[PDB]
């Protein structure tokens, strides 16, 4: 039981950090989609013109 | 024969007119298309990151 407790922190600790690193994956695909809203907005006016 | 010639002239004077004026309509075209498209640079290096 000494060891089995030692042993069942460490599947949680990766759990915790591999989540929290997508977490700051997921902030770069976000930040990218204000391209594609100027891209629209710029593709629009020219038929306008 | 003066008045046909001054007609005539006419014509060719109000056509080459119009084949300047189509020019410069290509002007605003290519500053609207370089300022939308060079984002994709841009969007180029957030993909790397």
Redesign the interface.
């Known amino acids: 039981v000494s060891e089995s407790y030692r042993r069942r922190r460490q599947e949680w600790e990766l759990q915790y950090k591999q989540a929290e690193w997508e977490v700051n994956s997921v902030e ?1 695909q976000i ?2 989609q204000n ?1 594609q809203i ?2 629209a907005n ?2 629009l ?2 038929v306008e ?1 | 024969q003066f008045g046909s010639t001054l007609l005539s002239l006419l014509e060719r004077k109000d056509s080459l007119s119009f084949d300047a004026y189509q020019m410069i309509q290509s002007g605003d075209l290519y500053r609207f298309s370089i300022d939308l498209q060079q984002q994709d640079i841009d969007i180029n290096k957030a993909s790397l990151e």
Do not use: V
């Open positions: 770069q930040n990218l391209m100027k891209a710029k593709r006016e020219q013109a």
